[PDB]
Structures are given as structure tokens and as C-alpha cells.
């Protein structure tokens, strides 16, 4: 009856390789240490046209049946075609707003058709909803088979354990977050806390968290959830294929992605490429990654010649989830940038957050890892490689919401050695009709 | 303009023979007589489609990519601002929010199976503001457009309302203003209008000095106020009780539970139900609970006295004709309840911590019986609210016992000591 399947498979696996593994498998890793991915039946899938899959996936957007009103789970069979419905933890994610930067675009870059991804404004506000929503379902899934998974455990600033123990919480799976204690106090840590999860504040710095997960995980029934999962990828790339989608089946020019770990931009790309390849469309985007000048590992790799990659030590950012040294994901992002034909830019830490605050001012409220992507974008302008009339898919990873505290600092004047060229402070003036008239006829 | 359908400004209520009404064109916010302005449609141009016609027209452009009808608001256009022009409008792909099944939540602490919460606090902004606010700078960059004299829109709101206001504004170019007292001034709070590029001014004086100030000053300047008198953003409201319906595929809820501090939105709610049942699109209307704080004005002490002793006539209609009822929720009551929906997923706004506890209360006095198809309006995203998390979860609110906090567990970086705490937890 259901012909579609999936299956672990090394990364890039090489000519007439025959290693696989049941999703059921609880793996991590392959028979060489390298990472996992998953691989669907491509035979399977062949045997309906692209005509059918837009039909089909076009038919499902936004409609009240279960469970295929997920901008994730609309794709269902491209995710996990053989987990049940009753399986599925989902908190209608994605179908995300593909807002129309008209006058940024317009005021700032020239650029008619620039599009922003509001990827921020989900369930817990972030993109990883996307990805959690895969990887707790397979996890309720294994739970419910009696396979041996009491719960989830991972150490990750804020962005993966909201997620995480935000779907954990609804499905009734126990989710153990591990965190430094002075490093983050209590502040950004209050989703995983208010979602039921169980928290341990260590004495030590995040890596000594990220140790200390591994080596719980390494005796007890629990489950990693770390950068390394190819599932959390699974869900991530339906972001490219709703893209796609919200452009009735066209492909846009360029797609601008905050790299951190590096598995999201390679995502995107595994959704573009898939539509390509099964016939909704007939060509993919070309893609652009954008880090931080601090965490700058494939900034240096590409401008090498995809040559000399070396694990370099992050310097503090206020684009907190970028900040990666040694990114778990780099062969995967390399062999995208590659294939797609793409490019890698970095941002200072100045660019990041005045590309941020221009981007507010045409009404948003985006995360400090879009302004090091809107960044990339001002570069790329500059360098002509990026056309004003080329449309342009820029990837807002976080709402605003969720990095108040680098905005009020901004605004504030309150950052050392930093500029604030586009900071907009409340003004001061007595009560007196005059006064108040001139500011405002200034203003005018 | 070959439209059949119209809208203008009318009095809430007047009986004999009034003909009072203004255009939506018109700059106005009260009536002769001071009372609330109300946006009426020509529900007979309507009534020419049956049920069937507005049901099928609603459900094919639902999530839809075509302009302006993604919209959960603009997807019912005809019903909202039937005379702007598509090119116009000022859409940030609103409502089209989450009806959220509280299964762990339902089943677990309140005995229900069919218990759903509503997150319209996940939005362009961060709260259901967005709903009335796209109707509002929608109108207002219509007139600008048409060289109508409106040189910008102000208001007096820390919160929610300016936070969506101003987003709204500064993407169609409209200068946003912001009045305010200079030492009710938070930088947290007005983190988003600051960041929308909103002129917000500090003026040395109290909640009455600014009030007369803005009267002064729209007397001279044409500046668009928004406030809570304001009926076109519940227009927008109104679409989000249509949109739990169209959720349902046009099933009525036996109850809908909507926090009320400024009573416009219930009404709203009441509006949209309303509006579905006398064009056909469904037979009835969902009961409906009015959620108060302790601390908040006397709405649920006059339901309490059987309807005998802003928007508080506006509200209470409402209620009269749905058959409603209104609850109190106390400060460690709503936080409690908050607690206890967000161990379970969910990330909501004390507001809905409130709606929460008045479905709590209702349930045990056996009004809302557990098999009852009930839909909890959370107003805003937790986010907007995670310093009273904060204090909730370490137990740092004074007079208030916490007694569902979950402070995180103090452990070195010793194998051993963090296996025995994690055994301890997992033995349970
Ligand atoms: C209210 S339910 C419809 C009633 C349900 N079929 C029943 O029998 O009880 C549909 C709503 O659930 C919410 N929802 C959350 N996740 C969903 C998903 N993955 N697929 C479809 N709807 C989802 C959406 O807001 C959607 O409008
Ligand atoms: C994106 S507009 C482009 C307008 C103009 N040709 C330009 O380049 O500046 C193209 C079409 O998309 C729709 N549209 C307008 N504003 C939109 C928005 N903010 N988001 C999504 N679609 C929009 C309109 O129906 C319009 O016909
Ligand atoms: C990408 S535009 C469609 C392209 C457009 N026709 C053009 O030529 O430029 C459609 C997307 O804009 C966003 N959008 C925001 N507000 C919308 C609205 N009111 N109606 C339709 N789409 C809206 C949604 O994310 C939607 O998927
Ligand atoms: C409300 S669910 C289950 C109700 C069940 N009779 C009970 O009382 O436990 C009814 C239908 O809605 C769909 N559904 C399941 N989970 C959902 C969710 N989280 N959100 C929206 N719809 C869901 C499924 O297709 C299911 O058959
Ligand atoms: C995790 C995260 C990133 C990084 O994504 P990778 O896939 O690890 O590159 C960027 N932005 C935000 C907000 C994140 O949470
Ligand atoms: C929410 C609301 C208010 C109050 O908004 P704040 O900015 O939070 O004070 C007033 N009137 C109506 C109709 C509302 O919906």
C-alpha cells in the first residue's frame, strides 16, 4: 500500500556503497565515524511526476487535516513516509511568512523582488521547530514500540533545547537540558524551564556541557539531540521547498542562510535539489552562507578555493547560535555550497547589527544571525554579484523576541566601542504645546 | 468599483430612528453623542450569497500565495474592508495561527479531550494586535495614498498595540508616534517600536498631561489615533472567531474563552461568530467566557448580580446574547495555571493563564462538561512575558508559594553526582 521509504546512509556515500540503517536504528554516526544521512527511495518517488507532487503538496497548504497542514508534514511523504499519524508530534509548524521587503529593498539595496523568511515567527521562535518536529516524532514513535528511549537530552544555547523540550513537553517525553551555570543565568533558558524539561545547571563552560551529555547518554536510555541528527535536517529542508512553493513553483535566484553549525544551509539545498530532481521544477537556486567575523570557518575555507579547512577558536558575538569554532556539519555545507554553485560571506560585528536595525525600520523584527545574512546581502550588492532585479530569499532564523536584550543595547547606546549608526532613541521634551508641535513638524 | 458590498461608521446602538453614520473615510472615534462607533456592513449586499458561497470562497484561498488573500484576515476581505484596493492593503501574512490541541493539558488537569488553545501570539509582532492592525494602517495608508490630509498614526500604548502599530507603519512608510509619560519609559517594553523606527517621545508628566497634550496637537495636525475606542481594528479581531470556525471546517465550539482587560476583543469574537451564523455559514454561536483578573474592573461582579449593576456595554451585550459568563482569576491563580499549560508545551501569556483558571473554575462548578469542544484565545506569545517566568520558576514572587516552579538542579562537573540526580528523576 505505502510505497515510499527512508534509511540511514553514510554522507555522500560512495560508488555502490551498500551500508544503510533502519530509521529505527538509534545511530549517530557511520561505520567510517562520519555523520548519517537520510536517504529516501528515489525509484519510489519517480513513479509520480512532478505534476502530481505539486498538486498534491499545493492541495494540503494550509487546510485543517491532519497531519498535513504542517509546512513540514504537508510534505510528509519526503520526511518520514512511513511514521504514523498518531505518531506525529506536530505544532503547525512552518508555513512561515515569505515577507515582501519592499522598502528595504527598495531604499537600501536597489532591489524590487527581495523577499525575508520569517522562519522566526513559529512555536517556540525559531527555525529548529522544523526540525524537532521530525525528531520527537520519531522518538514517540521508538517510545511507543518499547525500544529503550526515556527521554531526550542535549546541551544547546536556548535555540535546540526550546524546541526540543517544547514538542517533548505536548507528547509527554521527558527532556533533559544541560547548561553552564554562570554563562546563562536564568534569562534565556525560561522555555526549556517553563516546558517541564529537566535542567541541570553544571559547573563548567558549554563544552564541559556538551562533554558531560555524551557521556550520560553513552550508559543511559536516552537520546542525543545534537547537530549531528540528519532527522532535524528532514524537517529543515521543507523551509526550501515551502519557498518553492510560495512562489507558485519558481525558483528564485538567491537564498541567503545563516551558517552556524552549517546543517541548515545544506538543508535548504537538499529541498531545492529534491524538487529539482523529482520534477516539480526543473532548475535549483544558488545559494549564499553567511557567518559571523568571529566564527568565520568557511568564510576562510571558500575564499581558499574549497581548499584548507581548519577549526578555528569563535570569538564572542551577539549572534549568539552562530558563534561555531569547529562546525559539525562542514562537509556537508561544502559539498552544497559546491553543487548549487554558491558563496560564503562573513560579518563584523558592527555589519551584523546595522543591517539588523535597517531592517527593523522597514518593519520587522529580526535576530542579529539575519543581519549577519542581510550583511552578506549589502556585500554581494556591492560586488555586483547580486543583480537588483534578481529575486532573493533571505532566511530570518529567530524572531526578534527571542534577542531583546542586544536591540535595548543598541537603541541604548550602550555597546562599547561600537557605533549605533541607525539607533532610534525616545526623545525628551517638556509638556508644552510649542515644543512638542516643532519636534513633530521636524519629523514631518 | 463594481462592488456590491459596503461598510461604514454607526452608532453602538440608538433604537429610535437614528440615522447617524460616517463614511470609513472619515477621521472620527465617537459619536454625537460620545457614545462607541461601530463598523456596519451591508449585510443585505451579504445575504445575496448563501452559507454554502462564503464558506467555499473562505476555505480556497485559506494559506493560499495569492494577494491579499493569504491573509487570515484579508481571506475574508468581503467582510473586513470591502472597498480597499488589494495594492492598498498593509498584509503581514497574519492570523492563519495554530489551533493547538491541549491533549496533555486537557486530559491530564482539566478530565477534557476536546480542549484546544488558540496561539494568536504567534505573529508578525507577537500578539492578535496584528489582526486589527493591518485593518487600521490598511485605511489609513488608503488615505495617504488618495491625498487625503494624514501626515501619521499615534497612540499611548507601552504594549502590545504600539509594538503592532508601529511594525504595520514603518513597512508602508507611515510615520508612527508614540506619546508618553517620561518616566513610564521602559526600553525593554518599547523594545519593538523603538526598533520599527517610531518617533517616541518623553514628555516630563503624568497620565493627564499627555492625554490633553495629544488633544492639542490633533486639533492642528491630522495624526490618526489609535486606542481601545477604535472599531476598525476589530474588524480584523472579529476574522480570528471566523478563522476557529473555518479551523473546524465550520463546526461551532460549545464554549470559547477570550481574556478580557480591554473587553473590545470579546465582542470581536462575538462579532465574527455572529456575523458566520446570520450569513449562513453555521447555525449557531459558540457560549462564550469572559476572562477577568482579580484585580480588574467590576465586569464579572456585574454578571454576578444578573446584569443589573471602556467597551463595558460594548462587552456585556455581547455576553447577554451568546449566553455567556464571566470568571475572576487571582494573581497566583492565573500564574499557577500558567505554570501548569506551559509544562505541557505550550508558552502563553498571563492573559491566557487567566482564561485558563476560568476554565478551571467552570469545569468544577460542572457548567463545561468534559466532552465540550472548548477554544482558549491566548492573546500573546510567552515571550512578551518571560520575566514573570523568571521570578515564577525561582520561586522570587513574594506572597505567592510557586507551587509548579521548576528551578533547574545545581550539579559539578562530576559524572557520578550527575547520574545520581538523573536516577533519582528518571526512579520517578
Ligand atoms: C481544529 S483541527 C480540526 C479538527 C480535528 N480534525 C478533529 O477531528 O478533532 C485543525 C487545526 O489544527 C491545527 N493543527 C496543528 N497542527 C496541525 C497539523 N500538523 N495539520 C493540520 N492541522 C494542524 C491547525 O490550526 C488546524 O487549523
Ligand atoms: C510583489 S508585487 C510587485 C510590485 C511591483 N511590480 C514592484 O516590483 O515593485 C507583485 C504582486 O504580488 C502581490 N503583492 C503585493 N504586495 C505583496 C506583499 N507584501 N507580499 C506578497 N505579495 C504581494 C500583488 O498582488 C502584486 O500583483
Ligand atoms: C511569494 S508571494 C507570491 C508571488 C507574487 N504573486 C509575485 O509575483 O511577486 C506569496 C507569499 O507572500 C506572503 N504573504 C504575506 N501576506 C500575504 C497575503 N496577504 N496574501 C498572500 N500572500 C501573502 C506569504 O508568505 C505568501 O506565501
Ligand atoms: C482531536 S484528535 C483525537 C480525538 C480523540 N477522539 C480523543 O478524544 O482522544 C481527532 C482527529 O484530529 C486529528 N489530529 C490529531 N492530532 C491533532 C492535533 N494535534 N491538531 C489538530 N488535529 C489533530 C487526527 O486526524 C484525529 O483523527
Ligand atoms: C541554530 C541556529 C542557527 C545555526 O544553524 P546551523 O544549522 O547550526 O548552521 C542560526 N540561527 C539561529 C537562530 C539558530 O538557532
Ligand atoms: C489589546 C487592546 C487594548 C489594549 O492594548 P495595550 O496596548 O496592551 O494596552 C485596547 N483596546 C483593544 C480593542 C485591544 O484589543
Not at 146 to 164: E, I, N, Q, Y
Request: hydrophobic share 40%; glycine share 8%; charged share 20%.
Amino acid at each position: 500500500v505505502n510505497p515510499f521509504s527512508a534509511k540511514y546512509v553514510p554522507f555522500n556515500a560512495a560508488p555502490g556503497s551498500t551500508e544503510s540503517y533502519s530509521l529505527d536504528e538509534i545511530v549517530y554516526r557511520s561505520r567510517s565515524g562520519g555523520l548519517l544521512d537520510v536517504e529516501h527511495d528515489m525509484e519510489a518517488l519517480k513513479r509520480f511526476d512532478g505534476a502530481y507532487w505539486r498538486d498534491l503538496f499545493d492541495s494540503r497548504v494550509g487546510k485543517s487535516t491532519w497531519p498535513y497542514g504542517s509546512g513540514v508534514w504537508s510534505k510528509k511523504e519526503w520526511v518520514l513516509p512511513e511514521i504514523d499519524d498518531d505518531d506525529i508530534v506536530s505544532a503547525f509548524e512552518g508555513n512561515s511568512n515569505l515577507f515582501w521587503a519592499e522598502r528595504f529593498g527598495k531604499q537600501f539595496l536597489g532591489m524590487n523582488d527581495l523577499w525575508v523568511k520569517h522562519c522566526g515567527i513559529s512555536h517556540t521562535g525559531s527555525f529548529k521547530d522544523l526540525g524537532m518536529t521530525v525528531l520527537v516524532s520519531q522518538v514517540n514513535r521508538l517510545r511507543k514500540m518499547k525500544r529503550p528511549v526515556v527521554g531526550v537530552g542535549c546541551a544547546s544555547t536556548g535555540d535546540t533545547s526550546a524546541a526540543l523540550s517544547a514538542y517533548c513537553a505536548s507528547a509527554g517525553i521527558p527532556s533533559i537540558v544541560f547548561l553552564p551555570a554562570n554563562k546563562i543565568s536564568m534569562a534565556q533558558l525560561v522555555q526549556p524551564i517553563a516546558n517541564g524539561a529537566f535542567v541541570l545547571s553544571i559547573d563548567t563552560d558549554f563544552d564541559g556541557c556538551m562533554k558531560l551529555i555524551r557521556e550520560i547518554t553513552a550508559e543511559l536510555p536516552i537520546y542525543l539531540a545534537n547537530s549531528l541528527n540528519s532527522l532535524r535536517l528532514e524537517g529543515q529542508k521543507t523551509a526550501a521547498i515551502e519557498i518553492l512553493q510560495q512562489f507558485d513553483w519558481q525558483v528564485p535566484d538567491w537564498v541567503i542562510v545563516p551558517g552556524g553549525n552549517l546543517g541548515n544551509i545544506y538543508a535548504f539545498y537538499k529541498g531545492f535539489k529534491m524538487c529539482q530532481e523529482l520534477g516539480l521544477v526543473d532548475r535549483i537556486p544558488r545559494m549564499v552562507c553567511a557567518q559571523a567575523a568571529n566564527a568565520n570557518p568557511l568564510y576562510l575555507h571558500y575564499k581558499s578555493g574549497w581548499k584548507d579547512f581548519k577549526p578555528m577558536t569563535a570569538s564572542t558575538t551577539f549572534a549568539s547560535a552562530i558563534q561555531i569554532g569547529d562546525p559539525v556539519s562542514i562537509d556537508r555545507a561544502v559539498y552544497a555550497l559546491k553543487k548549487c554553485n554558491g558563496i560564503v560571506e562573513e560579518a563584523t560585528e558592527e555589519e551584523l547589527m546595522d543591517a539588523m536595525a535597517q531592517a527593523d525600520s522597514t518593519g520587522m523584527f529580526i535576530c542579529p544571525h539575519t543581519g549577519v545574512a542581510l550583511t552578506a546581502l549589502f556585500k554581494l550588492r556591492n560586488q555586483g554579484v547580486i543583480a537588483p532585479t534578481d529575486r532573493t530569499v533571505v532566511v530570518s532564523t529567530a524572531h526578534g523576541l527571542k534577542f531583546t536584550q542586544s536591540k535595548i543595547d543598541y537603541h541604548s547606546n550602550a555597546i562599547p566601542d561600537m557605533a549605533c549608526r541607525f539607533s532610534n532613541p525616545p526623545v525628551d521634551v517638556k509638556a508644552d504645546f510649542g515644543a512638542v508641535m516643532d519636534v513633530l513638524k521636524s519629523y514631518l
